[model samples]
Target: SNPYARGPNPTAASLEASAGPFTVRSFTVSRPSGYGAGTVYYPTNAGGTVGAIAIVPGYTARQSSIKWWGPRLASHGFVVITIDTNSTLDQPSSRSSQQMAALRQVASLNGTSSSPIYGKVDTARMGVMGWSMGGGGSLISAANNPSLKACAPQAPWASSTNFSSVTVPCLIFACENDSIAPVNSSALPIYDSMSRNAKQFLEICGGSHSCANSGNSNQALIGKKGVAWMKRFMDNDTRYSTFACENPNSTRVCDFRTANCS
Candidate 1:
């Protein structure tokens, strides 16, 4: 009852989250697989060496929650792994180990050896994504772990601050109307301190801390842009090159198209 209740909210329920755009298979992380609860949705076109994005759910929230973005990204050619970090305090140290383990599980399941999930996965192009506590996890993981090529942290928790250490390309989605992780507390500090040359920080209007799970139309657009940004950075897509530069004004399309690039 606790798991179901804390998982995806009923108001935002959608059939796509349950049955993804592709054939989704479930797997246990390690021994005592029951400890971590989540789902993984693979892209329908799995033959190519596509990238992977690991999704970490917020506190006491099941992995099923905030899964709307998984299938959407997979449809755009990326395998997604959503981890259930319900017990973790959204602390950097705890999520550090969990994120690493999640990555390892993904690698093992998609390994060349005889496995049902075996397939060509470009491990080099890997990223992390999370909302709230999970968002904080992505930040910490991306900062400490060099293996991660990019990260998307949406309304991350406070303890997961200090973006100066985050070298990988990062996209920080700060909710303008958030109350839980106030914009001033979460985004202001991190955005100002991040050392990554390749980083995109945007504030979404009317977006709350729980926007990622609420499936709000505004949040969906943000999610779509987040997925696109991740794909562009991880895959090294030249199409996204102009907008990704340090000078947003010089690019054809500014970050979130929120500004005039010309």
Candidate 2:
């Protein structure tokens, strides 16, 4: 059985929506651990337990900046948590640590029968995502914890670009016009370094540093790719293979590259 598969078989229109088949609900962490603050979104009925994903914001940014992903992913059958670091100025490595901490709390919530998400998460099946410095942080998390099922960071930036040790399936959403963390130097090189796993690089046409952030004009495509990547990798559901790996020939995508995908 495809034990992890959830929701209806994916369709282009379904995955492109701002939300998915399941109804979504969220809760705030009363006392955030390891990280500053967090909000977890979950699907009321995803048919079975689902993977958990951690999303963080860039330097000097807050939860609202990356909030769009919470509902977008949870409705598709994930326990999605978006967090704020202890300090807005935290670096990539620290953000990476906090992101994992956020996931840990999510797992802890799954065990505490008193928690809202108790018994809802498949803690063993988890992933990471973020934007800018947080995006780089997602890569760092993947590198440090190779067991993570998937990663899809956007407009990533870090002091160092080499990340060849990350064996997790990754999908990077880059902004074509991002001066903050130019794709050529940041996203592209990072994508190149991890040549051994299933990975993809999508540079949004005429995009800026926030292209893949909340309220992005390209949400239809970006949302589709993000959802497809997680579903395909974290769930090990081949039902998502074509949706996750196929090139989105739209002009909205400036450039697309893949390796070991499907």
Candidate 3:
């Protein structure tokens, strides 16, 4: 039996909501290690300890760009941290380090009695997420630490597109009209490079670089796919298999592809 399963059976509306079933709370980390400041979002009662996920923003971007993911995912049964990098201009590799560092601090907070997330995180089930360069950073983290449960990055841009070494399950959100990190050169190539593990690619129709960011127009579908991917890979919850791998058949998705998802 999967001990990690949580919440009621998922539905279209349930997964499409801005929040999930669990009551959520967040706190600013008093002393952040490795990265810049961070806000930790967590569920007050997810039934049992749940996994942790760290999310980072793109080049010259702050946590606000990706902050929506914190509560969105935390309320769905995971501890989520949205981080500011040591420097806004930090590259993908540096962002990767900071991303893992944030995850490490979350793991540390799990043991700290004074921390709000104490006893709330199953550190072993951690995942990575990011936007643009931060997205590339997440892929780098996945490649470097194959132990990571899953990776989901949006409009990722990096110096290199080759990530054939990544064995972790990954989901990449691409922007169809992105001029910054074009799907042809970035997200798609990055998605194409990883042949050793389960992977999925979703491109937002007419979306720009910020399509997967906080104020995007396709939150309903994006929210559903993101939560499903995390649930399927990080929790090993079969209940999300269809949600995780199936083509959404929605017009919002201009392109969709997946492999090894069943």
Candidate 4:
């Protein structure tokens, strides 16, 4: 069966602040599609370029799972937004529509505090990220929206057949032990299909599907490194360009133990 046609599992929850100098607000968007939930975390200082991050949750995932790095990203000068997609618990069509709608809303929220919404958000430099199902969803959207500059998919369950049209800078995060969206099934196919110039495929040395979100030492390191990847690509940190570039032999790329994927 096509992974794209599968609805989410609905075990996911909205995001909440873990720890940091930022505030997280979770909300539900309503339309003909269904109820789309998202969490926005912005720095309390509100005195920076406000790098924008849109997080799409995976199948059966709770929005809260992505929050592990929400405050951490915010502390590093990012305004992160995580949305819930359609699954068994969430409406599929509506969730998809709402995810796109939230993207538009986040873009609009950039640099316009006069409105009652998030005015400090800088949507101009926006990036999208997702895990599993959400990763595939983000890819589909990024391919269609020029405003979306970068994308990262964790243990993505994307199919080359459905995602052959994508042409954005994609950072593919693969779990060594994942079975649901096995690395070979999703990440490798997408990597082989995508043009090398704009795509970076990374396999975390070892772990199951849950490792990407787990609080374990290995997962935490991977999480930190993943956030740095976003900072390098979405936040325009040229230092990270090497990770997304061609330097397979570089110690940085070879040093997977550091989570820098260098």
Candidate 5:
């Protein structure tokens, strides 16, 4: 019954390159309510509606910091939105509110006859992701909105690291050498606090604060893990279990920790 289910089909094992079978088309959302603007990426011929994901950039950063996820995830059967904050300096809480607004805008577009993605998005299935403060905002969004399918945050920085109230499945990417939002203070504590949810932590060796950003050398591994997490939780596709549960063999991944993942 799920249009986005991968079934038994063979899926790509790496994010080093696009694994989607459709061409990606993108458009700009001139003025989404409550946010500055957004860029949407979706499959041209996916044959069916797919889950949607919203991504936000960190404090002082614009869409370009996390825009790569638009094509990377959209090409692989998702409608991805990469947004710019109302103010580049917006805090995590503000970013979280705007991120959800972006998703709502996508849902609105699905019903607009003039939109290219009309009827192409399964608005019921949605996910959120981000970097730095935006990543923390993503976690906050999950905690506040339990209906979210999944959450993935990279080098998240929050005033409080406790997000145990989050019930949505989460995957966190941490940089080993991050001085801004050090792993010990930000990512690890937040991951440890989420005791009631299915979660995973991927620590990159020698990674910088923005290690998971676009053009990272570990895109292959990061992409695989990210797509797998979304597929498993967002699409409820068990076919990606191995990719999400099994320990990665890549040297770039220094540490991989998982809890409550099947």
Candidate 6:
């Protein structure tokens, strides 16, 4: 009953506008324990439990900036949460705490009989993702919480670029043209620092700092890469190895690097 045990559906992976096989449902999480309010997305019929991922947005940004990831990921058989921080100006460490709080909330919902996600989540399989500073926060969470199955940070930025403690499988998306948190100073260094873990770094050609947000023109490719990484690592399913490692040789990518990905 593993809906996403294999690679993404070919049709869904090729079309940015497509929905997955399951019926999707959503709910609001009001003022959760250690974070601000947020929204959750889950599949109604995955035939069994599925992994869950918590997504956070960048500095001075809200859930709306990265909300597309909710549907994009959930449709493929994972429970997804998009959260707002207590303050839009919260730093990466603060965002990292909130991200973990959101995952704790997801675990609580799995045991709540009335919750739509009750018993539908495989709490043991969890992943984290984010944008900008929030993306850096996701790395912090993965470093601090080694139990995290996967981490994918898009255009991540942090005050310090040394996250050498992170051992979780990671996929970092870097925007080639970002003046803010330029790839050389931020993404590349962080990826380089994580030499002890399985990781991949992808630099998108002509991309802005917010290039991979909700309505980006490259979603057709980004969405697939994100899901593939999560599926391969979070679900520990090798079926997606080709999808995660073999497609970056294209005109869309400026540079690509991988270590122990397969």
Model 4, position 225: C-alpha lDDT score: 50
What TM-score do all the candidates reach, one by one? 0.77, 0.99, 0.99, 0.72, 0.96, 0.94
- What is the per-residue lDDT of model 6 for residues 101-143, given as tens digits with 9 covering 90 to 100? 9999999999999888999999999999999989999999999
- In candidate 5, what residue range of length 10 has the lowest lDDT sum? 6-15
lDDT of 6 at 138: 97
Model 1 stretches with alpha carbons more than 4 Å out: 1-35, 86-90, 112-116, 242-262
Scored against the true structure, residue 209 in model 5 reaches a CA lDDT of 93
Q: lDDT per model, in order? A: 0.62, 0.94, 0.94, 0.57, 0.89, 0.88
Task: Show where candidate 2 strays beyond 4 Å.
Answer: none
lDDT of 5 by residue, 1-262 (tens): 6556842453554444655566899999866877999999998877778989999999899998887788888877899999999999999999999999999999999999999899999999999999999999999999999999999999999989999899999999999999999999899999999999999999999999989998787777888888889988998877788787778877888878999998
Clash pairs, candidate 2, are: none
Runs with alpha carbons beyond 4 Å of true place in candidate 4: 1-35, 86-97, 110-117, 159-164, 214-216, 242-262
Q: Count residue pairs with overlapping backbones in model 3.
A: 0
Clashes of each: 0, 0, 0, 12, 1, 0
* Model 6 worst lDDT window (10 residues): 6-15
- Candidate 3 lDDT, tens digit per residue, 5-120? 99999988999998899999999988889999999999999999999999999989998999989989999999999999999999999999999999999999999999999999
Per-residue error for 196 in candidate 3, Å, reads 0.4
Model 1 error, position 58 (Å): 1.3
- For residue 98, model 6's alpha carbon misses the true position, in angstroms, by 0.4
| Local error of candidate 2 at residue 262 (angstroms) | 1.4
Model 4 C-alpha lDDT per residue in residues 1-262, reported as the tens digit of each score: 3211111221111111233344544334333133256677666664455667777777677777666655666655576777765452443233335556666776665544643245556566777776776677667766667566677777776544255556556777777778888876776776677652266666665567765663633433344455556655665555445533433442222122212233
